[PDB]
């Protein structure tokens, strides 16, 4: 359940070294395509004409071996950011040479070091290489958690290490990475190979790499311990970090020599793989939604569109969600009719937006266990789902369920509603126009009628995710505004992200609205205290809803309804990422706008730096009325 790699910087013979690495239990091998000590001269005339092959044959491995087993390493002497010019241009021509040989071999990944602050000329040559051919190979940048200058032993008399807390200086390696990728314009082929030090840094420094495209974790043999039995082990602190990585499904890579006579590299993995089993399988919600991690989708629009048969099916694969509805109705039924009026007072229940009728059946089970009599209207506008309803009224429901095929805003009802039941809420609560729908349907709800859900609330929280920022950035399509993908929300099971503040309420709607004058236009102004240095990429959205009384449904992480995978969080992006210092406040503003044809969201950032107003006039995203 763990994919691991072996980092070597010494191969005498590929086929004999790779065969060794394979038997020990490794999925791939990181090795130098060129001899690490083979400095080559490209300009200077005595040494430019060095004879012989510049490296070993490609024939030493099969085609699929290079494609799936081998991760290239760029030679340690390549220093394109050197202060000496001759070293710069040799490093330039040689970095291109090594990189071009990796693409020649079809290697899936290439390792590049980020061991100093300035890799500007490094980023450049790399970028040109990315923009020469159109390829999909990845580039793993080695960046350690703690810089080599901040880990050195305090054994120099006249240069003692700084014992003070450099809060932003302890995060300095992240700045190496951030500046590198920003120079490379967020190329999808450039990911992080995080090197784990013997002694870990501060918690914020580790938190810094939340949301970053970490494809690999480097585990040197030196950071391992020795249990009472004499085998390599890891501290609880270190183990927690690995557990955190396990959640991102990074590949785990061992580097350095093994100091144990009891030798054998499998033990180092034996403990590592061992850890995966120890991590609890599954987290319940995680099992079902696997493969949807960080997967961008357009939010469903049941009103404007007609949902397919299999999206109604996934809706029903959540009993927990309906139990709350069942219970809310249950509780409500008892409240409205007393025990002596039980068999005389029949209640008009109306499932507005019945779909394939899970709500109508939950309304039936609620009436049975409440021992009160109900007349039930199943109202659905999607003609295709109505076919399921009418087949299921005829076969089993009978005349207790009346199926109505119309829009609830248009539908004239024969009877007034004792209770109306709605499932209209979206990921961001009202993004599915549940307000406008239930509003136009209040007229057939009697004056003391209960609407389920009574209210719902949208929540917002700023997030940091360079991973997710590329995916939106990759969403550009032809025949449309090149930035329109940034001005539209997405429903997505957020995974590799970092929440930057506690979710705050955004919009609220109460049904029945009543009010002399109903207006679903909204202005809400939020301020999010941020206690860490970071980069703002977007705002995650959740919702809480109160079906009736205490019963509720929620995807807000603090009050997340346990065991409910029915809804995913929504993500509002911003065109340009915004850097945020510790102690700064993220002020965001959101608008719910509407005309007579459509409803949309506008949003902007007025915090540390202003951001353009997103989706103005609904130019890039509408919710059709």
């Amino acid at each position: 359940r763990v994919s691991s790699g072996r980092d070597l910087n010494c191969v005498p013979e590929i086929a004999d070294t790779l065969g060794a690495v394979a038997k020990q239990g490794f999925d791939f091998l990181c090795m130098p395509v060129f001899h690490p000590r083979f400095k080559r001269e490209f300009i200077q005339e005595p040494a430019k004409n060095r004879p012989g092959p510049q490296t070993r044959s490609d024939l030493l491995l099969s085609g699929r071996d290079w494609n799936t087993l081998i991760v290239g390493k760029l030679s340690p002497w390549i220093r394109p950011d050197s202060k000496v010019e001759k070293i710069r241009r040799n490093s330039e021509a040689a970095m291109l040479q090594e990189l071009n040989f990796g693409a020649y071999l079809g290697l899936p990944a290439f390792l590049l070091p980020l061991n100093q602050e300035d890799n500007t000329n490094l980023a450049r040559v790399l970028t040109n290489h990315i923009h020469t051919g159109h390829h999909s190979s990845m580039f793993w940048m080695r960046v350690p958690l703690v810089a080599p200058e901040d880990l050195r032993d305090d054994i120099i008399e006249n240069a003692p290490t700084t014992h003070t807390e450099e809060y932003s200086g302890e995060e300095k390696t992240w700045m190496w990475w951030h500046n590198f990728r920003t120079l490379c314009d967020y190329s999808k082929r450039i990911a992080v190979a995080l090197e784990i030090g013997a002694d870990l840094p501060s918690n914020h420094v580790i938190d810094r790499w939340l949301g970053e495209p970490i494809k690999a974790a480097i585990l040197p043999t030196s950071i391992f311990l020795t249990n009472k039995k004499g085998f390599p082990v890891l501290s609880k602190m270190h183990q927690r970090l690995i557990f955190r990585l396990l959640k991102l499904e990074v590949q785990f890579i061992i580097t350095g020599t093994n100091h144990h006579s009891e030798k054998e590299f499998c033990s180092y993995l034996q403990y590592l793989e061992y850890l995966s089993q120890n991590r609890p399988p599954p987290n319940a919600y995680e099992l079902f939604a696997k493969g949807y991690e960080d997967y961008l989708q357009s939010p469903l629009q049941p009103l404007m569109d007609n949902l397919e048969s299999q999206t109604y099916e996934v809706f029903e694969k959540d009993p927990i969600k309906y139990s709350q509805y069942q219970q809310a109705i249950y509780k409500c039924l008892l409240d409205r009719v007393p025990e002596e009026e039980k068999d005389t007072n029949v209640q008009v229940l109306m499932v507005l937006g019945a779909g394939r009728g899970p709500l109508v059946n939950a309304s039936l089970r609620a009436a049975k266990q409440a021992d009160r009599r109900i007349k039930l209207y199943a109202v659905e506008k999607n003609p295709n789902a109505v076919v399921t309803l009418e087949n299921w009224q005829f076969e089993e429901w009978g005349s207790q369920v009346t199926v109505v095929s119309s829009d609830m805003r248009e539908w004239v009802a024969p009877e007034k509603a004792d209770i109306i039941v709605s499932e209209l809420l979206g990921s961001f609560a009202d993004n599915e126009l549940s307000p406008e729908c239930l509003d136009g349907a209040q007229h057939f709800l009697k004056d003391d009628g209960v609407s389920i859900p009574g209210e719902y609330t949208s929540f917002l929280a700023p997030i940091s995710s360079s991973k997710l920022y590329n995916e939106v950035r990759a969403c550009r399509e032809k025949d449309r505004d090149p930035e329109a993908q940034f001005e539209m929300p997405y429903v997505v099971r957020l995974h590799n992200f970092h929440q930057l503040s506690a979710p705050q309420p955004c919009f609220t709607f109460s049904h029945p609205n009543r009010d002399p004058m109903i207006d679903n236009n909204r202005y809400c102004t939020l301020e999010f205290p941020v206690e860490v240095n970071t980069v703002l990429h977007g705002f995650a959205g959740y919702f809480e809803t109160v079906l009736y009384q205490d019963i509720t449904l929620s995807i807000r992480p603090e009050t997340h309804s346990p065991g409910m995978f029915s809804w995913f969080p929504i993500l509002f992006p911003i065109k340009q990422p915004i850097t945020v210092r510790e102690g700064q406040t993220i002020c965001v503003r959101f608008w719910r706008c509407s005309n007579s044809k459509k409803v949309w969201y506008e949003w902007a950032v007025t915090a540390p730096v202003c951001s353009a107003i997103h989706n103005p006039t609904g130019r890039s995203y509408t919710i059709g009325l």
């Binding site: 910087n9 010494c10 191969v11 005498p12 013979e13 001899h35 690490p36 000590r37 083979f38 400095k39 001269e41 200077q44 005595p46 040494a47 004409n49 060095r50 012989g52 092959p53 510049q54 490296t55 070993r56 044959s57 030493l60 340690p76 050197s82 202060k83 000496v84 001759k86 070293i87 061991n115 810089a147 080599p148 200058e149 880990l151 050195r152 032993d153 305090d154 054994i155 120099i156 008399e157 006249n158 240069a159 040197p220 043999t221 030196s222 580097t255 350095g256 020599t257 093994n258 100091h259």
Partner: protein, 309 residues
């Protein structure tokens, strides 16, 4: 002669011992098999010729550096992350390994035996410097003072507890295991081009020379920490620095511009040899006559230069 068929192209080090026998260390930096070997030639003129050798064994990985241990022992800085000690037999025909300890996590780049002959210091690309006990095959101390791969370590003469070390963190560290903080940085090279080579002066306890990557050679009085005397000797990284065994030693520099140069006390220039076509890697003067200086290269030549004193 109980030796491998051919040796590898990249001659990486050449050392003379007391009696005049030439030690050779070569690695296969390119090709199918990346390994190394150790060679001894009691005749120095037939050194590049495998069949005309006195001894010859063949090691697992590349020989990044070597040094003599006494008169019948070779300490090896091997690519495999290990330091290796090989020792001739009594007949001096077979070279057998004494130990092979894998303590460095990267290429062992440099190694130097101390004045006591019982200890040796090694530097590697893992930034760690280790103190070795060559009798108990163990590491005496794990020093991690630099922040970049260690380029050169040079044991002090007549001081079994002092040695030099230079890394790509632009630092030169004067070491003394007697002090609580055993390392002492040299403030001269505050903006200096990265140091690449180190050589103590034989006669003086506090005098040593370093070579930077811009081809500049400078000698420093260590005790005074005063302004050094500098001279642009080469056009590439200065690979190594050796002093002649004379009473007034000449300074022989060698760099990646494929040229060997010999200097005096004021670092003036007496002799270049352009004879090498590739990188020059090591220098060792003949102790039998003191005007011969032989240097190897990656062009697989050994060149016996006559140093015109």
């Amino acid at each position: 002669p109980n030796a491998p068929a051919c040796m590898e192209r990249q001659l990486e080090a050449a050392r003379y011992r007391s009696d005049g026998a030439l030690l050779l260390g070569a690695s296969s930096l390119s090709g199918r098999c990346w390994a190394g070997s150790l060679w001894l030639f009691k005749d120095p003129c037939a050194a590049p010729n495998e069949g005309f050798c006195s001894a010859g064994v063949q090691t697992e990985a590349g020989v990044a550096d070597l040094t003599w241990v006494g008169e019948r022992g070779i300490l090896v800085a091997s690519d495999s992350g290990a330091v290796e000690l090989w020792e001739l037999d009594e007949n001096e025909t077979l070279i057998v390994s004494k130990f092979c300890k894998y303590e460095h996590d990267d290429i062992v780049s440099t190694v130097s035996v101390l004045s006591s002959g019982t200890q040796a210091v090694s530097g590697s690309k893992d930034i760690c410097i280790k103190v070795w006990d060559l009798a108990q095959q163990v590491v005496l101390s794990s020093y991690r003072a630099h922040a970049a791969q260690v380029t050169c370590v040079a044991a002090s003469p007549h001081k079994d507890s002092v040695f030099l070390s230079c890394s790509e963190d632009n630092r030169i560290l004067l070491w003394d295991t007697r002090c609580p903080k055993p390392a002492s940085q040299i403030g001269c090279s505050a903006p200096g081009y990265l140091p690449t080579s180190l050589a103590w002066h034989p006669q003086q306890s506090e005098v040593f020379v370093f070579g930077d990557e811009n081809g500049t050679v400078s000698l420093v009085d260590t005790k005074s920490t005063s302004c050094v005397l500098s001279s642009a000797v080469h056009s590439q990284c200065v690979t190594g620095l050796v002093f002649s065994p004379h009473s007034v030693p000449f300074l022989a520099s060698l760099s990646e511009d494929c040229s060997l140069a010999v200097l005096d006390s004021s670092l003036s220039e007496l002799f270049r040899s352009q004879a090498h076509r590739d990188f020059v890697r090591d220098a060792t003067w003949s102790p039998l006559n003191h005007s011969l200086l032989t240097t190897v290269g990656w062009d697989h030549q050994v060149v016996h230069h006559v140093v015109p004193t």
